[PDB]
Every structure is written in structure tokens, then in C-alpha cells.
Design an enzyme around this catalytic site. Structure first.
Site, PDB file in Angstrom:
ATOM      1  N   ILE A 105       8.800   7.612   0.047  1.00 48.98           N
ATOM      2  CA  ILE A 105       8.854   8.554   1.173  1.00 48.98           C
ATOM      3  C   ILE A 105       8.058   8.090   2.393  1.00 48.98           C
ATOM      4  O   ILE A 105       7.983   8.815   3.383  1.00 48.98           O
ATOM      5  CB  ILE A 105       8.400   9.941   0.729  1.00 48.98           C
ATOM      6  N   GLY A 106       7.477   6.904   2.318  1.00 51.94           N
ATOM      7  CA  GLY A 106       6.739   6.346   3.439  1.00 51.94           C
ATOM      8  C   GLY A 106       5.942   5.133   3.031  1.00 51.94           C
ATOM      9  O   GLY A 106       5.959   4.723   1.872  1.00 51.94           O
ATOM     10  N   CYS A 131       4.043  18.002   0.367  1.00 55.99           N
ATOM     11  CA  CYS A 131       4.568  18.996   1.298  1.00 55.99           C
ATOM     12  C   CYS A 131       6.078  18.722   1.200  1.00 55.99           C
ATOM     13  O   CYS A 131       6.575  17.719   1.720  1.00 55.99           O
ATOM     14  CB  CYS A 131       4.033  18.717   2.689  1.00 55.99           C
ATOM     15  N   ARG A 155       3.746  13.220  14.293  1.00 52.79           N
ATOM     16  CA  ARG A 155       4.076  12.313  13.181  1.00 52.79           C
ATOM     17  C   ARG A 155       3.110  12.403  12.021  1.00 52.79           C
ATOM     18  O   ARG A 155       3.437  11.896  10.949  1.00 52.79           O
ATOM     19  CB  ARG A 155       4.179  10.866  13.648  1.00 52.79           C
ATOM     20  N   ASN A 156       1.945  13.050  12.219  1.00 56.23           N
ATOM     21  CA  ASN A 156       0.936  13.151  11.167  1.00 56.23           C
ATOM     22  C   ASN A 156       0.797  14.581  10.667  1.00 56.23           C
ATOM     23  O   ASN A 156      -0.252  14.925  10.102  1.00 56.23           O
ATOM     24  CB  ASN A 156      -0.389  12.625  11.713  1.00 56.23           C
ATOM     25  N   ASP A 211      -2.199  13.279   5.292  1.00 56.67           N
ATOM     26  CA  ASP A 211      -3.294  12.493   4.736  1.00 56.67           C
ATOM     27  C   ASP A 211      -3.960  11.719   5.884  1.00 56.67           C
ATOM     28  O   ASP A 211      -3.265  11.164   6.732  1.00 56.67           O
ATOM     29  CB  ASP A 211      -2.731  11.519   3.705  1.00 56.67           C
ATOM     30  N   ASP A 253      -6.347  11.098  15.337  1.00 59.36           N
ATOM     31  CA  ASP A 253      -4.912  10.763  15.186  1.00 59.36           C
ATOM     32  C   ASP A 253      -4.059  12.016  15.046  1.00 59.36           C
ATOM     33  O   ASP A 253      -3.170  12.097  14.189  1.00 59.36           O
ATOM     34  CB  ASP A 253      -4.702   9.841  13.954  1.00 59.36           C
ATOM     35  N   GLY A 280       0.147   0.205   0.713  1.00 66.10           N
ATOM     36  CA  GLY A 280       1.366   0.130  -0.076  1.00 66.10           C
ATOM     37  C   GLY A 280       2.258   1.334   0.112  1.00 66.10           C
ATOM     38  O   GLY A 280       1.907   2.271   0.840  1.00 66.10           O
ATOM     39  N   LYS A 330       0.190   7.787  -3.425  1.00 68.28           N
ATOM     40  CA  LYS A 330      -0.105   6.627  -2.594  1.00 68.28           C
ATOM     41  C   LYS A 330      -0.402   5.473  -3.536  1.00 68.28           C
ATOM     42  O   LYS A 330      -1.223   5.610  -4.450  1.00 68.28           O
ATOM     43  CB  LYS A 330      -1.353   6.883  -1.730  1.00 68.28           C
TER      44      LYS A 330
HETATM   45  C1  LIG Z   1       0.890  10.589   8.196  1.00 65.74           C
HETATM   46  S1  LIG Z   1       1.363  11.950   7.103  1.00 65.74           S
HETATM   47  O1  LIG Z   1       1.707  13.108   7.890  1.00 65.74           O
HETATM   48  O2  LIG Z   1       0.418  12.066   6.054  1.00 65.74           O
HETATM   49  C2  LIG Z   1       2.828  11.396   6.333  1.00 65.74           C
HETATM   50  C3  LIG Z   1       3.954  11.127   7.095  1.00 65.74           C
HETATM   51  C4  LIG Z   1       5.118  10.698   6.479  1.00 65.74           C
HETATM   52  C5  LIG Z   1       5.116  10.493   5.103  1.00 65.74           C
HETATM   53  C6  LIG Z   1       3.982  10.760   4.350  1.00 65.74           C
HETATM   54  C7  LIG Z   1       4.017  10.504   2.850  1.00 65.74           C
HETATM   55  N1  LIG Z   1       2.935  11.261   2.190  1.00 65.74           N
HETATM   56  C8  LIG Z   1       3.110  12.607   1.915  1.00 65.74           C
HETATM   57  N2  LIG Z   1       4.322  13.144   2.073  1.00 65.74           N
HETATM   58  C9  LIG Z   1       4.514  14.420   1.776  1.00 65.74           C
HETATM   59  N3  LIG Z   1       5.765  14.981   1.976  1.00 65.74           N
HETATM   60  C10 LIG Z   1       6.939  14.258   2.272  1.00 65.74           C
HETATM   61  C11 LIG Z   1       6.990  13.252   3.244  1.00 65.74           C
HETATM   62  C12 LIG Z   1       8.208  12.631   3.549  1.00 65.74           C
HETATM   63  C13 LIG Z   1       9.356  13.084   2.933  1.00 65.74           C
HETATM   64  C14 LIG Z   1       9.320  14.102   1.971  1.00 65.74           C
HETATM   65  C15 LIG Z   1       8.115  14.718   1.665  1.00 65.74           C
HETATM   66  C16 LIG Z   1      10.586  14.586   1.312  1.00 65.74           C
HETATM   67  C17 LIG Z   1      11.743  14.415   2.303  1.00 65.74           C
HETATM   68  C18 LIG Z   1      11.726  13.043   2.924  1.00 65.74           C
HETATM   69  O3  LIG Z   1      12.770  12.454   3.214  1.00 65.74           O
HETATM   70  N4  LIG Z   1      10.574  12.443   3.235  1.00 65.74           N
HETATM   71  N5  LIG Z   1       3.543  15.218   1.349  1.00 65.74           N
HETATM   72  C19 LIG Z   1       2.296  14.771   1.217  1.00 65.74           C
HETATM   73  C20 LIG Z   1       2.046  13.429   1.519  1.00 65.74           C
HETATM   74  C21 LIG Z   1       0.645  12.889   1.442  1.00 65.74           C
HETATM   75  F1  LIG Z   1       0.517  11.783   0.618  1.00 65.74           F
HETATM   76  F2  LIG Z   1       0.226  12.533   2.714  1.00 65.74           F
HETATM   77  F3  LIG Z   1      -0.213  13.887   1.039  1.00 65.74           F
HETATM   78  C22 LIG Z   1       2.818  11.190   4.961  1.00 65.74           C
END
Ligand SMILES: CS(=O)(=O)c1cccc(CNc2nc(Nc3ccc4c(c3)CCC(=O)N4)ncc2C(F)(F)F)c1
Length: 259
Positions: free
Chosen positions: A15-16, A89, A137-138, A151, A133, A21, A41
Site C-alpha cells: 500500500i506504499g 486506516c 499526502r500525510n 505515520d 510535514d 522498505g 512497515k
Molecule cells: C504518509 S502516511 O499518511 O502515513 C501514508 C500514506 C500512504 C500510505 C501509507 C501506508 N501506511 C498506512 N496506511 C494506512 N492505510 C492505507 C493506505 C493506503 C491504502 C490503503 C490503506 C487501502 C487502499 C489503498 O489503495 N491504499 N493506514 C495506516 C498506515 C500507517 F502505516 F501509516 F500507519 C501511509
């Protein structure tokens, strides 16, 4: 203790990406509960002690905060492969959430998201934590009625969001976070459009120095645009504090709901 047993995590789709990593969606099966959706992560070079320390310090940084509008740490797995397990989320990135729902989200929801972020930022300012930051986007979306700051490691220059004193003199304070939050509010009211699209960073610096600001978004209440412009006071002492933004956004939200 928050060490999680590896067999209780199922790694899902990516998802990112992060500095260390890929980040995945996944499932955590705790000993007493049904399935919990989580974000994982990962860390490619965490066999190196200095990389492991820096990566795990990102989990310690989130662990010190406890707020409904900041993502939470669930746990860590500290032996290779080193993982940090965060709350998921489920609705993902705020920018794409607002883009897809441009014609389906009420203006009150957009103002609610700004209010929620102002509560998280007032909480961080009470802990003397300077984020550096703040940008759409965050921000992540937990539900249609709930956004959270993402995060802090994954959130880590964003010239188009930065206060002049941060760009020019590397000064980062709660007042420079207020300038960034004004930009984030503008992004929300613009349904996920970025500030200064197409413009080169060097040109943005000169434009902001000379008084140019982001324009009033279509349908933005004039009181809310007035508040964004105060966040962009050139003199940092003239910007509102996050507790003032929180109170003023609550007033604007209530007014919109009453219309
Ligand atoms: C900088 S940021 O704002 O932290 C951020 C931005 C983008 C991506 C991420 C990845 N990390 C996390 N992503 C999510 N939810 C998530 C994100 C993207 C997507 C989805 C769910 C499902 C649909 C889809 O397509 N993508 N929840 C929690 C985190 C964590 F690790 F930051 F806590 C973090």
C-alpha cells in the site's frame, strides 16, 4: 510489552513505500480477538544495527502519542525481518479519498476533517512536538467521519507547503506547522488538489515572499478562507495557535451544519 509474534501477522498487498522498505496492508490475529486489519512497515536493511535502531525509533516516536486523530502503533517484531505493525486506516490516502468523492462529500465533512486534524496538532503542540510535514499526502482516512495524521516516519523538501522561515532559514516551530496546516486545509477544501500545481519550487519561494497566496477554493466559506490566510502570515508571531484554530474551526463547522 508490544513485541508481536510473527505467526499472528499475515502480510497482504503493498500500500506504499517508505525509506526502509515497502508497507503492506495485512491482518493481525491477537490471542484473544477476531481479525484486526493492520499496516505493516517492513525494513530491507534491518540486519544492520544502525538501520534497525533508526527504523524501530519510528515505532517509539508513534508510541509516545495517544490521540484519536493520530495513527497508533500496535506492535513491533524486532528480529529480522524487522516489522512495525500500525493501525490500518482502511479508507486510505486522504487525497485520493477526496478526489473520488468530490461530488459526494458535504462541505461539513471537509470542515470536520480540518477540525479533527487541528485537534491532533493542538495535542502535538502541547507535547512540544514539531511535525514539519503537515500535508494532505500525510493524512489517512479511518472512516467517512474520521481522518488521522499518518505515520511520522512515512510522512518524511515539501517547499510548496512550507513557511518562508523554514525554507529560507531552516526554522521549524509550531508556527511553521500552522503555515503547513493552512496549506493542508486548502488541499482539503480543494478536494485533494495540490498547492501550486505545475509551478517550479524556486518560483513558489519568490511568489510567497512577495505576498501571493493560494486562492479561495470554490465553495469555501469566506470565514474559513480568512482563517487559512492568517495561517499564512509572513510574520510567524501573527499566525494563530492550534488551540485557536481548533476553536474557530468548531465554530465554522457548526455554522455550516446549521445551513
Ligand atoms: C504518509 S502516511 O499518511 O502515513 C501514508 C500514506 C500512504 C500510505 C501509507 C501506508 N501506511 C498506512 N496506511 C494506512 N492505510 C492505507 C493506505 C493506503 C491504502 C490503503 C490503506 C487501502 C487502499 C489503498 O489503495 N491504499 N493506514 C495506516 C498506515 C500507517 F502505516 F501509516 F500507519 C501511509
Amino acid at each position: 510489552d508490544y513485541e508481536i509474534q510473527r505467526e499472528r501477522i499475515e502480510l497482504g498487498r503493498c500500500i506504499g513505500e517508505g525509506q526502509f522498505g515497502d508497507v503492506h496492508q495485512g491482518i493481525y490475529m491477537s490471542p484473544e480477538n477476531p481479525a484486526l486489519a493492520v499496516a505493516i512497515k517492513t525494513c530491507k536493511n534491518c540486519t544492520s544495527d544502525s538501520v534497525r535502531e533508526k527504523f524501530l525509533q519510528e515505532a517509539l516516536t508513534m508510541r509516545q502519542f495517544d490521540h484519536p486523530h493520530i495513527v497508533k502503533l500496535i506492535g513491533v517484531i524486532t528480529e529480522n525481518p524487522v516489522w512495525i505493525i500500525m493501525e490500518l486506516c482502511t479508507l486510505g490516502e486522504l487525497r485520493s479519498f477526496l478526489q473520488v468523492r468530490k461530488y459526494s462529500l458535504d462541505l461539513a465533512s471537509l470542515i470536520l476533517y480540518a477540525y479533527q486534524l487541528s485537534t491532533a496538532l493542538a495535542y502535538l503542540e502541547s507535547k512540544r512536538f514539531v511535525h514539519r510535514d503537515i500535508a494532505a499526502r500525510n493524512v489517512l482516512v479511518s472512516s467517512n467521519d474520521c481522518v488521522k495524521l499518518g505515520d511520522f516516519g512515512l510522512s518524511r523538501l515539501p517547499i510548496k507547503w512550507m513557511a518562508p522561515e523554514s525554507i529560507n532559514f531552516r526554522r521549524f516551530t509550531s508556527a511553521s506547522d500552522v503555515w503547513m496546516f493552512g496549506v493542508c486545509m486548502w488541499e482539503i477544501l480543494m478536494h485533494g488538489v495540490k498547492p501550486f500545481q505545475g509551478v517550479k519550487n524556486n518560483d513558489v519561494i519568490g511568489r510567497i515572499e512577495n505576498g501571493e497566496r493560494l486562492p479561495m477554493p470554490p465553495n469555501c466559506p469566506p470565514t474559513l478562507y480568512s482563517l487559512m490566510t492568517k495561517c499564512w502570515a509572513y510574520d510567524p508571531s501573527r499566525r494563530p495557535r492550534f488551540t485557536e484554530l481548533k476553536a474557530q474551526l468548531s465554530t465554522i463547522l457548526e455554522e455550516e451544519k446549521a445551513q
